[PDB]
Amino acid sequence: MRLEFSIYRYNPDVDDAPRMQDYTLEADEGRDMMLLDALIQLKEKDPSLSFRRSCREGVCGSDGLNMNGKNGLACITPISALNQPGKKIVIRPLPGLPVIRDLVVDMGQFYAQYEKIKPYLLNNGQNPPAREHLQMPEQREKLDGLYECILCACCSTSCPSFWWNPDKFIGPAGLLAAYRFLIDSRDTETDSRLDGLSDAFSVFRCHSIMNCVSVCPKGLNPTRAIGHIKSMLLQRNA
Amino acid sequence: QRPVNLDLQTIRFPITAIASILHRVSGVITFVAVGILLWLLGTSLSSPEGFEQASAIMGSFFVKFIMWGILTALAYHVVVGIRHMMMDFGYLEETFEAGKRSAKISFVITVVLSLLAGVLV
Amino acid sequence: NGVHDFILVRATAIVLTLYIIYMVGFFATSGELTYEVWIGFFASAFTKVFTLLALFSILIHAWIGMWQVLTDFVKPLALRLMLQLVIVVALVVYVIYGFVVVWGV
Amino acid sequence: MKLPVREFDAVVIGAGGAGMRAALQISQSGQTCALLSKVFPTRSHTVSAQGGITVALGNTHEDNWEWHMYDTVKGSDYIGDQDAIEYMCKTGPEAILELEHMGLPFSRLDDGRIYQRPFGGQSKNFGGEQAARTAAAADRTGHALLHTLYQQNLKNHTTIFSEWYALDLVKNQDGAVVGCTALCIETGEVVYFKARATVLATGGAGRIYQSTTNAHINTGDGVGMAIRAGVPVQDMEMWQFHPTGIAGAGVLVTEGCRGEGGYLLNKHGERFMERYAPNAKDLAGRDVVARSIMIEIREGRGCDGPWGPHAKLKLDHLGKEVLESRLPGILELSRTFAHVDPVKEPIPVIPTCHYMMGGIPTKVTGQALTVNEKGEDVVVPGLFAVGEIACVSVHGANRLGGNSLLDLVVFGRAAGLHLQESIAEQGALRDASESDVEASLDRLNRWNNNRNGEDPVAIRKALQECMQHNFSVFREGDAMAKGLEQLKVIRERLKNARLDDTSSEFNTQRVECLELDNLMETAYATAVSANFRTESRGAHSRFDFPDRDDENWLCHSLYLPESESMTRRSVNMEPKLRPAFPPKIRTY
Numbered sequence A: 001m002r003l004e005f006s007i008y009r010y011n012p013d014v015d016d017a018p019r020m021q022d023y024t025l026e027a028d029e030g031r032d033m034m035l036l037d038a039l040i041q042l043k044e045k046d047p048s049l050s051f052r053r054s055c056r057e058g059v060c061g062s063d064g065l066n067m068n069g070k071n072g073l074a075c076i077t078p079i080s081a082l083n084q085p086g087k088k089i090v091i092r093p094l095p096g097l098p099v100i101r102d103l104v105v106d107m108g109q110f111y112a113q114y115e116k117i118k119p120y121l122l123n124n125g126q127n128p129p130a131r132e133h134l135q136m137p138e139q140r141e142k143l144d145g146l147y148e149c150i151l152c153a154c155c156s157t158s159c160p161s162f163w164w165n166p167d168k169f170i171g172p173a174g175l176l177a178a179y180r181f182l183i184d185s186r187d188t189e190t191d192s193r194l195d196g197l198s199d200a201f202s203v204f205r206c207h208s209i210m211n212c213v214s215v216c217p218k219g220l221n222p223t224r225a226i227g228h229i230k231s232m233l234l235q236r237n238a
Numbered sequence B: 001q002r003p004v005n006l007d008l009q010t011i012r013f014p015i016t017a018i019a020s021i022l023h024r025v026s027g028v029i030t031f032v033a034v035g036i037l038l039w040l041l042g043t044s045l046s047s048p049e050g051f052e053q054a055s056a057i058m059g060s061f062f063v064k065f066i067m068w069g070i071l072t073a074l075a076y077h078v079v080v081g082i083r084h085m086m087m088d089f090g091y092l093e094e095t096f097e098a099g100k101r102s103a104k105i106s107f108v109i110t111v112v113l114s115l116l117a118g119v120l121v
Numbered sequence C: 001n002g003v004h005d006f007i008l009v010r011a012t013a014i015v016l017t018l019y020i021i022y023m024v025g026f027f028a029t030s031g032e033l034t035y036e037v038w039i040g041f042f043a044s045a046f047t048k049v050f051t052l053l054a055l056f057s058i059l060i061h062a063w064i065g066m067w068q069v070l071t072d073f074v075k076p077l078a079l080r081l082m083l084q085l086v087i088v089v090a091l092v093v094y095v096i097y098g099f100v101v102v103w104g105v
Numbered sequence D: 001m002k003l004p005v006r007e008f009d010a011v012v013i014g015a016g017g018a019g020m021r022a023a024l025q026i027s028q029s030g031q032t033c034a035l036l037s038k039v040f041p042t043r044s045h046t047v048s049a050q051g052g053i054t055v056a057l058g059n060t061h062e063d064n065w066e067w068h069m070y071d072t073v074k075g076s077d078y079i080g081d082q083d084a085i086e087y088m089c090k091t092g093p094e095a096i097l098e099l100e101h102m103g104l105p106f107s108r109l110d111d112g113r114i115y116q117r118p119f120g121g122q123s124k125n126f127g128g129e130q131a132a133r134t135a136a137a138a139d140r141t142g143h144a145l146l147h148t149l150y151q152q153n154l155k156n157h158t159t160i161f162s163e164w165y166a167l168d169l170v171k172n173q174d175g176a177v178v179g180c181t182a183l184c185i186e187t188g189e190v191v192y193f194k195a196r197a198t199v200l201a202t203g204g205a206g207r208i209y210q211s212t213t214n215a216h217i218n219t220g221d222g223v224g225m226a227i228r229a230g231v232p233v234q235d236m237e238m239w240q241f242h243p244t245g246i247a248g249a250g251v252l253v254t255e256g257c258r259g260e261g262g263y264l265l266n267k268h269g270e271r272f273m274e275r276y277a278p279n280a281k282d283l284a285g286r287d288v289v290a291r292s293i294m295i296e297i298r299e300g301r302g303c304d305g306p307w308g309p310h311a312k313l314k315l316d317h318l319g320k321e322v323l324e325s326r327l328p329g330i331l332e333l334s335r336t337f338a339h340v341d342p343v344k345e346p347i348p349v350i351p352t353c354h355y356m357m358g359g360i361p362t363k364v365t366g367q368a369l370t371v372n373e374k375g376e377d378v379v380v381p382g383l384f385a386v387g388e389i390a391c392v393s394v395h396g397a398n399r400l401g402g403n404s405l406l407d408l409v410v411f412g413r414a415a416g417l418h419l420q421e422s423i424a425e426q427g428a429l430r431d432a433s434e435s436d437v438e439a440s441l442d443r444l445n446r447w448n449n450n451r452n453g454e455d456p457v458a459i460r461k462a463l464q465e466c467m468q469h470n471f472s473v474f475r476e477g478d479a480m481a482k483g484l485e486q487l488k489v490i491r492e493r494l495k496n497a498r499l500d501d502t503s504s505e506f507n508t509q510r511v512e513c514l515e516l517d518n519l520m521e522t523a524y525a526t527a528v529s530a531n532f533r534t535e536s537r538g539a540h541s542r543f544d545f546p547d548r549d550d551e552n553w554l555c556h557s558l559y560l561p562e563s564e565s566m567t568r569r570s571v572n573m574e575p576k577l578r579p580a581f582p583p584k585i586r587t588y
């Protein structure tokens, strides 16, 4: 069976602006493949097509794309979930980020917000443990749904508030990470952290639009995380 | 300088995202509406003649329309603002499923109020 | 700061909701809207107070709201501060014009 | 110099688990250090790691680092250097506890300590009852580890050159490695990273096979680079085929499945592992469990289906509550790539190419080794290697599950701890001339000039197929000699292969071409090696020499890149803190 794709192209050494190019691929009828299988093959036909990928199993976060209007990972989105009668499969870069080339976006700003929330354990060193820090399975439970984040950018690049203020609003991904250290029982710097999220933009630009949740390839929920952050901010500063 | 993909037509938006953008618009409308509604109130109170003039304004079909719109936008902003606030106090879940559901129930509650606003006008 | 903005919006929202309940309440239970029952409702102290209270609430609530909206879309500084000037003045006008209407009834 | 020169005390090529522990450790010792990576550090293959880290913490039960040393030496089929395995197993506990202090989110026992699960080839009392010493975070342990080490390199303000592809090592006129040339993927700029220590941490090379658990980025880059610089590789024939890769996909399900109580079934519903390994059963050594599944299929007792030939991994008996808590990662992996729900129905699984036991020979310090004309070891000044690209060797002929993550942390950290003594020991090194650097660029220039040659796609497909057929779980001298003949052919084709995309702004084609060169030297080094070793040890399994030959092959094999021949190196059997374990017959 025949598949058609409309794929975003751009090279600054060649292209004046970005353009949609058409592609056809002969696929096995009885087999279903992933979008990444299709992209890999299209690069055998057209070597100039550039895109990120690694793990091919939806763990590393490399191949976040806007597919038929919605963010996801190519490596885990089946062709069958995209393919419709008489309509092309429309592949475009993640929204709101500078396009480097074709389907590759400069993740700079996405990382920079991540760095801004101090995503590392901060333990003052007082009452140090004999061996490992002791964490009851109860408290470790609070990290589930937060530490699994793959920094794929799907959520943030689907958040309007992030579009409008990508360098002032932390974004869903960032805020998820923030909460990952806010409730870690091994992190002692909770107050210090909160005091750095009290301004108008860092956290409060989130308006529960909920684009973040619907797109997360790992089914996490940044909304609920941000909810708990706001909670703590009121608890502290109100 | 580099290009970005921000063509809003090339992007799917779920129902909660629509619900949100309409809350933002409905707010901006309701802002201008208060001035209009105050100006109308001012007239309808200044003298017995002012009031008759305001009933006459309200009689115009074109006004009845703008008035119904104004009250529809307000009714929306309130129902979808109460949804928002309920979420903020934990009365609604913050899962994607509980989001879609309450958004729809917000559209239904709004239409009902929009009709009753049509009746009042 | 951010937390302050968040509480003020939601507080004024509650006040304004109670006011709307009160306005729609009267409107849906009065029948014929004669000049005399209209002015009678708006000459009542209860109504005058709740109205200005509501007008102050719109000052604060709308100002924050408008600010949020403007800092998402109006990027250049000059133009943004001009629009805020207009927007604030407008809201201040709303409260003052409100004071004029109801003091004179 | 007509190239930009960026000088550091140390250049770490690779930001996987081992690169990042090393970079972090070099950096805290007050030396300038550049961390390179062809992907963003957290996309490195380590993220895909699942089961956990094997280490005698002794939380689940009382444990002893010597028992773990025993398990490993035996596991290795007696060709793992025992001084090194001793260092690793003993240092282990402190080295891992360090990560827990870095914030790594380990799962927990009821009393608050790090969760440890049972895993392949783990026993109390030197070969006794089944132990549980694989510390884990659900089955996302590699993810947990990598992200923690990235965060730690963020905290510590490490200079990270994300998305730069290392081309080749630069040698001065004394035969010392003094950095490497690298291509910036984003911009196309080519630069010379000058250093007194060049640390290769470029992971494995699963992509020389047709079916592999490895990420697309595992192209044996460090093997290529080292071979082209005339640095020998060692034990390249030892290729771990993980028992439970998903049938028809290659995506790994963890050994922690069997460790949590899951077991392998054949078409008749017989738990065939009880026959193949009566003591350890399904938690036997990986090379043994591997072959056991293949013998089962190879004799008609495997099952088929849409997945191809496979054995079943039954998990449903552990209950929803335990699967969704302890193994939720394979749950998603199974549903996605096998269309099978492990809570209801067994996962289809076939041994898949997983881990490269071979690599660049090293001291515990991380210093890279070569041999002189007499066969003795000499240090390669200014070159180091850690992680999967290293052959320390702590794994010998078969690696234990959860011992690779330990490898990364322990030797990564060790390479950093010891870097100052290592630089002082090798003395100052002479500057690279402009021709020395130019030589590193020869490989890249060839591709940038070849417009009309061969399609590299077909060259790759040829390569992987050749390995799959001729150098798999089972091997014979006949097929191996023919396999090597075709590789000489394919390697010829590659010298005339064409680069089809000419651009500079993020040209992924150029990279994937350069990768192919590395796939070649790695497949070749493996092929020449497997032919040379006329015995059956660990993962290496010949029909024509089915016996373990402790009298001729109790050694490492060494591929010499200049003369393209083979030779041997001593296994080390002098631990410092206990007597060695003597070789005996190894059965599970």
Ligand SMILES: Cc1cc2nc3c(=O)[nH]c(=O)nc-3n(C[C@H](O)[C@H](O)[C@H](O)COP(=O)(O)OP(=O)(O)OC[C@H]3O[C@@H](n4cnc5c(N)ncnc54)[C@H](O)[C@@H]3O)c2cc1C
Residues within 6 Å of the ligand: D013, D014, D015, D016, D017, D018, D019, D036, D037, D038, D039, D040, D041, D043, D044, D045, D046, D047, D048, D049, D050, D051, D052, D053, D054, D141, D142, D164, D165, D166, D167, D201, D202, D203, D204, D213, D214, D215, D217, D218, D221, D222, D252, D354, D355, D386, D387, D388, D389, D401, D402, D403, D404, D405, D406, D408
């Ligand atoms: C699915 C899976 C699960 C596993 N689970 C476990 C487990 O539970 N326990 C265990 O002990 N082992 C496990 N392993 C084994 C594991 O693969 C490795 O031991 C380990 O994770 C890789 O370590 P590394 O840092 O040396 O390599 P990698 O993590 O692959 O790092 C390679 C790095 O080198 C860089 N690089 C490569 N080429 C170049 C170049 N030329 N120039 C510049 N940089 C370059 C890359 O950018 C990358 O960052 C697992 C393996 C797989 C495939």
Ligand code: HEM
Residues within 6 Å of the ligand: A206, A207, A208, B023, B024, B025, B027, B028, B030, B031, B034, B077, B078, B080, B081, B082, B084, B085, C009, C010, C013, C014, C016, C017, C020, C058, C061, C062, C064, C065, C066, C068, C069
């Ligand atoms: C009566 C006059 C009112 C005016 C002029 C007004 C106007 C506005 C404006 C301009 C905004 C900007 C929000 C955005 O950017 O989307 C806003 C936000 C908001 N409105 Fe109002 N509104 C009024 C009444 C109400 C009422 C009664 C409620 C009760 C729920 C309400 C609920 C909210 C909430 C919760 C927000 C901010 C939501 C968020 O920050 O996520 N509004 N309003």
Ligand SMILES: CC1=C(C(=O)Nc2ccccc2)SCCO1
Residues within 6 Å of the ligand: A160, A161, A207, A209, B008, B017, B020, B021, B022, B023, B024, C072
């Ligand atoms: C920033 C924000 C909104 C917005 O700007 N979103 C948006 C949606 C679609 C198109 C443009 C903007 S909607 C509710 C409040 O939060």
Ligand SMILES: O=C([O-])[C@H](O)C=C([O-])O
Residues within 6 Å of the ligand: D049, D050, D051, D052, D242, D252, D253, D254, D255, D256, D400, D401, D402, D403, D404
């Ligand atoms: O089973 C796994 O998760 C993986 O294959 C384990 C090791 O140890 O490498």
Ligand code: SF4
Residues within 6 Å of the ligand: A148, A149, A150, A151, A152, A153, A154, A155, A156, A172, A173, A176, A215, A216, A217, A218, A219, A220, A221, A222
């Ligand atoms: S929450 Fe999900 S979509 Fe967002 S960056 Fe993390 S893994 Fe990606």
Ligand code: F3S
Residues within 6 Å of the ligand: A155, A158, A159, A160, A161, A162, A171, A172, A205, A206, A207, A208, A209, A210, A211, A212, A213, A222, A223
């Ligand atoms: S996409 Fe943005 S608005 Fe809040 S819940 Fe969502 S972060």
Ligand code: FES
Residues within 6 Å of the ligand: A053, A054, A055, A056, A057, A058, A059, A060, A061, A062, A063, A064, A073, A074, A075, A076
């Ligand atoms: S390829 Fe790594 S997640 Fe898609």
Ligand code: NA
Residues within 6 Å of the ligand: D356, D357, D358, D359, D387, D388, D389, D390, D391
């Ligand atoms: Na190795």
